[PDB]
Structure 1
Amino acid sequence: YPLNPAVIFIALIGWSAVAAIPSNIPVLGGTGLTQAFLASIQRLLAQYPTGPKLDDPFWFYLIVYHVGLFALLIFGQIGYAGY
């Protein structure tokens, strides 16, 4: 049934680029939805055991980025329903 396992990265183009340049400042990230995340993962990626529940932009921009990224890749497989 999944006849088209074609592309996934078109969602990574499709979800980061639509969420980088709109900053919409006075929220947690003064930058965009993704720029507040890629800067806030490189501080923790080099085997840092920290990141508690008070680490806001790691957990919050973890879930809010995965929930639109999941939705846009699922809708990308819906992008092989019109065939």
Structure 2
Amino acid sequence: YPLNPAVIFIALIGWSAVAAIPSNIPVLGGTGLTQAFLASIQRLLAQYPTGPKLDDPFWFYLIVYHVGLFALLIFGQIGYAGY
């Protein structure tokens, strides 16, 4: 059934770049939607047991990033329905 498992990475630029340059200031991210996450993973990446439930820019930009990323890669498989 999975006839065309061609590419995945086209969704990534398809989801980061559509949310990076829109800032939309007064929310959690005063910067863009993805810069407020990729900036907020390198503080925690080098073996940090922190990041509690009050850690807004990590935990919130986990779900609000992956819920569009999942949908846009699923629609990337819908991007092999016209084949």
| Percent identity (aligned) | 100
Unaligned runs of 5+ in 2: none
User: Over residues 1-30 of structure 1, what are the superposed CA-to-partner deviations in whole Å (9 max), with x where a residue is unaligned?
Assistant: 111010000000100000000000000000
Give the alignment of 1:2-81 within 5 angstroms: 2-81=2-81
Unaligned runs of 5+ in 1: none
User: Over residues 24-56 of structure 1, what are the superposed CA-to-partner deviations in whole Å (9 max), with x where a residue is unaligned?
Assistant: 000000011100000000000000000000000
Residues of 1 paired with 2:75 and 2:50: CA distance?
34
TM-score (norm 1): 0.99
TM-score (norm 2): 0.99
Residues of 1 paired with 2:31 and 2:56: CA distance?
15
Figure out how many residues of one structure are paired with residues of the other and give that number: 83
Q: Which of structure 1's runs of 4+ aligned residues deviate more than 2 A?
A: none
